């Protein structure tokens, strides 16, 4: 039953530099340990990324300012998260997301994942909900309520969960999830990377490459995506200051380095700085 409780006030926009985030593995092996220029779209380095609060944390508690704005998707999305509890466990893609154009839905289970395309009739509030199930049964949703109804589900798919939580997080290390969502040709591609972080709430300096998870053939156009989170009915939504960062990809981050094992340890962006363009031209880092 679609119950609406979200407020109607915007959040004061926040920004922060990416610090080189958004480089992922293209194609097959390259163990040369030598540069390999590529022409593919990534997230440009040192480009500031917004910072949305799913449950706006203001005052004594953030639960009084529920807010999950609908964000445009554009060419591609870099989605970064650090929420302790999996309040955000879903995703929605589409051009209008209103009972038309065969919108796309993705949902994550506690032990699985389901992707579907049923031309959903989305309810005005994209939530899921969770309930208690009477005898000898713990919290679990009786029914999804992301959308009013599903229509013919042209594409179906089920598999193991994308998000991993088996890692033992302590008071120092908190998991950070990064996802690159792209839609090229007839293929929707998701490149994910999970890694602990402890330095700060922001993204620490360093390097890391996102391996591909799946490559779903979906013949749909994506313009606006609204991060879907299974609002936990803590009658009465709640979240441990859940927040997510959204960046928009651009078609230039070219040079890619490799190490002995075959990992992308470092990379360069030719259009960032004149020095970087010089480094690209010589095909050398120094």
């Amino acid at each position, epitope marked *: 039953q679609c119950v609406n409780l979200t407020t109607r006030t915007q959040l004061p926009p926040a920004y922060t530099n990416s610090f080189t985030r958004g480089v992922y593995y293209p194609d097959k092996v390259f163990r040369s340990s030598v540069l390999h220029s590529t022409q593919d779209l990534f997230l440009p380095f040192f480009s500031n990324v917004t910072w949305f609060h799913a449950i706006h944390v203001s005052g004594t508690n953030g639960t009084k300012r529920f807010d999950n704005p609908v964000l445009p998707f554009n060419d591609g999305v870099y989605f970064a998260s650090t929420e302790k*509890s999996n309040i955000i466990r879903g995703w929605i893609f589409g051009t209008t997301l209103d009972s038309k154009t065969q919108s796309l839905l993705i949902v994550n289970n506690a032990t699985n994942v389901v992707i579907k395309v049923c031309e959903f009739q989305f309810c005005n509030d994209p939530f899921l909900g969770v*309930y*208690y*199930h*009477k*005898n*000898n049964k*713990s*919290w679990m949703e*009786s029914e999804f309520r992301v959308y009013s109804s599903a229509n013919n589900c042209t594409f179906e798919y089920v598999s193991q969960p994308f998000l991993m939580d088996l890692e033992g997080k302590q008071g120092n290390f908190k998991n950070l999830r990064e996802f690159v969502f792209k839609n090229i040709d007839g293929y929707f591609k998701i490149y994910s990377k999970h890694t602990p972080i402890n330095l700060v709430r922001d993204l620490p300096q360093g390097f890391s490459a996102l391996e591909p998870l799946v490559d779903l053939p979906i013949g749909i156009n994506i313009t606006r995506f609204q991060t879907l989170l299974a609002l*936990h009915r*803590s*009658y009465g939504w*709640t979240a441990g200051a859940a927040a997510y960062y959204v960046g928009y990809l651009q078609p230039r981050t070219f040079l890619l380095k490799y190490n002995e094992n075959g990992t992308i340890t470092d990379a360069v962006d030719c259009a960032l700085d004149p020095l970087s363009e010089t480094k690209c031209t010589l095909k050398s880092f120094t």
Partner: antibody, heavy 128, light 113 residues
Framework: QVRVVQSGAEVKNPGASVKVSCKVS????????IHWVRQAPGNGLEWMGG????????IYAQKFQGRVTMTEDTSTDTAYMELSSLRSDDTAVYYC?????????????????????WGQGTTVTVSS | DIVMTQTPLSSPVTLGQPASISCRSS???????????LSWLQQRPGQPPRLLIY???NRFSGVPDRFSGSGAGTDFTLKISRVEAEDVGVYYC?????????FGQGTKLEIKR
């Protein structure tokens, strides 16, 4: 906020089956467990039926045992108790309440409200 | 069986004075969780019993500042600062400690006349 709704009245005879309804709104019936509890006009409540959270089923009263069953549907969320051989102890407003368990995101601890929410209630009449 | 019985049957009282009811028990009401539990229901004339408290520590939603927990041992007490007219109906004292849920006969509240 929590509310409860119930039936209006019943007209029966001794030694015959009767059916009395109950429902928990505000907090869905799933959020708690209904205890079918009965009383006379201004009398103590008899624990005719208790939906034990531990057992997840209705247990009957010792005073009036061997006199009741139940029938419930989940799609329509309609819960009825099929009692029998009502009395003046039953000839009153049937108030049904539910015991709820409240916990944070984890299941650290479960409360037992016993009887959290109450409704208008159902009457009963027994005539020879 | 915890024998619950409210000693008084009627309570005519003049406005502006603390008043309460005793609720004796044959055996102790201590709960396995280690915290005691109490319950009080107020039934206004021709009205459903409104749960005054599901727990003495945490009273039910919509209880006047008058009603406050108190008592001596087995006897309980709903202390009142200044009595109000609406409380002129039946009263019930309940314990949610045990599964049988045995109740007393009940008490009626009236206006002095």
């Amino acid at each position: 906020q929590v509310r409860v709704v119930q039936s209006g009245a019943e007209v029966k005879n001794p030694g015959a089956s009767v059916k009395v309804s109950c429902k928990v709104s505000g907090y869905t019936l799933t959020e708690l467990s209904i205890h079918w509890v009965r009383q006379a006009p201004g009398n103590g409540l008899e624990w005719m039926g208790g939906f034990d959270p531990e057992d997840g089923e209705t247990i009957y009263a010792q005073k009036f045992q061997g006199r009741v069953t139940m029938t419930e549907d989940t799609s329509t969320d309609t819960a009825y108790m099929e009692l029998s051989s009502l009395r003046s102890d039953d000839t009153a407003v049937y108030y049904c309440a539910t015991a709820g368990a409240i916990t944070g995101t984890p299941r650290n601890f479960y409360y037992y409200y016993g009887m959290d929410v109450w409704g208008q209630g159902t009457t009963v009449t027994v005539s020879s | 069986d915890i024998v619950m019985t409210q000693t008084p049957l009627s309570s005519p009282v003049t406005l502006g004075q603390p008043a309460s009811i005793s609720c004796r028990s044959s055996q102790s009401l201590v709960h396995s969780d280690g915290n005691t539990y109490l319950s009080w229901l107020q039934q206004r004339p021709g009205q459903p019993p409104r749960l005054l408290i599901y727990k003495i520590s945490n009273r039910f939603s919509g209880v006047p500042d008058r009603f406050s927990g108190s008592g001596a041992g087995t006897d309980f007490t709903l202390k009142i600062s200044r009595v109000e007219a609406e409380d002129v109906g039946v009263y019930y004292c309940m314990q949610v400690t045990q599964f049988p849920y045995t109740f007393g006969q009940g008490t009626k509240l009236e206006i002095k006349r």
